[model samples]
Target: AQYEDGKQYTTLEKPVAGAPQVLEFFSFFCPHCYQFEEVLHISDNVKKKLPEGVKMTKYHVNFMGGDLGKDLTQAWAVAMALGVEDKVTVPLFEGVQKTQTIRSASDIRDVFINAGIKGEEYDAAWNSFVVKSLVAQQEKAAADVQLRGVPAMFVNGKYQLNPQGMDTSNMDVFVQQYADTVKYLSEK
Candidate 1:
């Protein structure tokens, strides 16, 4: 992801120690984001690419204020809180965006249940005070005065990269280029 307009990235006021602390900002309902799951190789990268001390996180945005918004937002944060996002992220996306059969909060919960999340366990995570706080925190970030967008990658809490419309030969090369760009920022 090369700088397009000389203003392609943002520098944070207080950078995190891990330079390229990549955070993916997205929601389940976004079709584009569903597609980006393939580009990022969500499951594979989480296991293979994430190194120690790398602050990789994702924000499930629900600023839209509707049933769909609120329900999916909680489901995803619950997945993260339960430390099972890697298992359900892609599946959730495909279920809703691709399969179009997952139609309710119950369905979302059931998906997690089928993924080995015990009913009570998910309930505890989904309804936890801290999990509720996650919703508010995400709203603030979405409303913050900066370059925020779906699938936006924030490196080290400062530099923002949106690999939404990038053209590349293939997924592998594109991934490598983004990986390289992340490394460059780490040393910059």
Candidate 2:
């Protein structure tokens, strides 16, 4: 859906099964997403207030850093395939920003190891069908959507751009407003 600012945007076609979905489109290399992470984490409380059928998921957009980003995204796909997305995603984020390190395939594997994921299990999951499919799906989403920025959000299937109209600088406030929008839309 297009926002009032005339920037056309789209969202996942399907609502998250059995729950209202909060889908955040982000890039690991994007400073904005890094800055916004803490606020997003706090907003989980807002998510919890939703009537039992609501969930939140993040989609890492991999159109940045050229091939390096793709490689990192593939590693993310592996984590998702292993059903350890929550286990790895936070560390991956911290590894990229807090540690001030560029996240490569090996770095991701290292993060997995630190999270107690065995090397063999990591390798096997990295090579699993789900990982391959997730990578392909992420690539397709990036291409099909014509995305151009990081830290974009979608509530259900609608884009909530500029939650407070002209104020986008205060990310914390913006995220709260966006959460309100999600609550409103989810009930509808």
Candidate 3:
């Protein structure tokens, strides 16, 4: 159950093509992802300073073969496809954290519903070929990175990030540290 920072970004064996990707491996069931979303809103926090041509994607990681991971990930994919990523992410975080009872796709669907996603649209997106393909891609993406935990950050498709650890107690300090890291690496 031990892992290095996986592989550093500099010595990446599998280099990314085109624009560099800022990939986030996270899970809604994960308290760490919840914390990052809760405290720093790290998903959106890192965007303002993302270097030009850098693309950001948050992949929902499935820790093991379980319904929660699969279901919630699909729910996220639905949001992404519907262009409702920002709106539903926090509610899903709150919903799962509040009650661990959220397990099935139907239940998770409600999170999007309450986020103002129309039932018809959600259902269509759920079964449609587009979201389904993207969801599969998301799964393969998390696995390709050999993701082992939530809140894992990758810069340019590598584990090499330069986040100077900060006083996590202060939200401003915490976000500043992350910004500093992105700026430093993007400049590098």
Candidate 4:
């Protein structure tokens, strides 16, 4: 009844090896993930509450956009590889979720180009093994978690945080409780 399994969290079948790490599965096509990052800034708020040395990693899911989902995931990997996630994430989110302007890789490229990434630079990273590897890893992680939807949160690779079990009407309480659960799982 209190932070119980199948209530507030679930133990992972095949647990990941990292402790004090938060892994999130999201999709650019999902407005909820967009709000979780952009509007509500839940990720930032949660990050602030995580104990020291705790790292949060995000995986872009490929189940939302059909063929385009893979491309978007690759785009995310490329942006992260280029160290431009801060500059590229929100714009892509706005384009895909809010503006409905991003429908293909061309549009995705334009976002990077506007961010000062050269065409060739984008291509190189897009085709590079490192970026490809990251995309594969992201996909694998998504599958490993058996993710059914976007904005799913996992802590320490062993516990999955269930927001529905928390107070969602109030942002402050939700974030605080979510962070406390994550902190508790990390210590387990």
Judging by lDDT against the true structure, name the best candidate: 4
Candidate 4: residue 22 Cα off by (Å): 1.3
Alpha carbon RMSD to native, model 1: 3.7
- What is the Cα-based lDDT of residue 1 in candidate 3? 18
Q: Candidates 3 and 4: which is better by TM-score?
A: 4
- TM for candidate 1 is 0.78
In model 1, which runs have C-alpha deviations exceeding 4 angstroms? 1-20, 42-52, 63-65, 145-148, 164-166
lDDT of 2: 0.64
Winner by lDDT between candidate 4 and candidate 3: 4
Off by over 4 Å in 2: 1-20, 163-172
Question: TM-score of predicted model 3?
Answer: 0.82
Candidate 2 per-residue lDDT, tens place, 47-130, comes to 655668677766677777676677777887877677777687677777877885654678767888998899998898778887
Alpha-carbon error at 123 in model 1, in Å? 1.8
Q: Write out the backbone clash pairs for model 3.
A: 9-160
Q: Which tens-of-lDDT digit does each residue in 84-106 have in candidate 4?
A: 88889888998887788988899
Find the candidate with the highest TM-score and give its number.
4
Worst 10 residues of 4 by lDDT: 12-21
Q: Which has the higher lDDT value, candidate number 1 or candidate number 2?
A: 1
Model 3 poorest ten-residue lDDT run:
1-10
Q: Which stretches of candidate 4 lie over 4 Å from their true place?
A: 18-20
- What are the TM-scores, per candidate, against the unseen true structure? 0.78, 0.75, 0.82, 0.91
Off by over 4 Å in 3: 1-20, 162-169
Quickly count the clashes in candidate 4: 0
List the candidate numbers ranked by lDDT, top first.
Answer: 4, 3, 1, 2
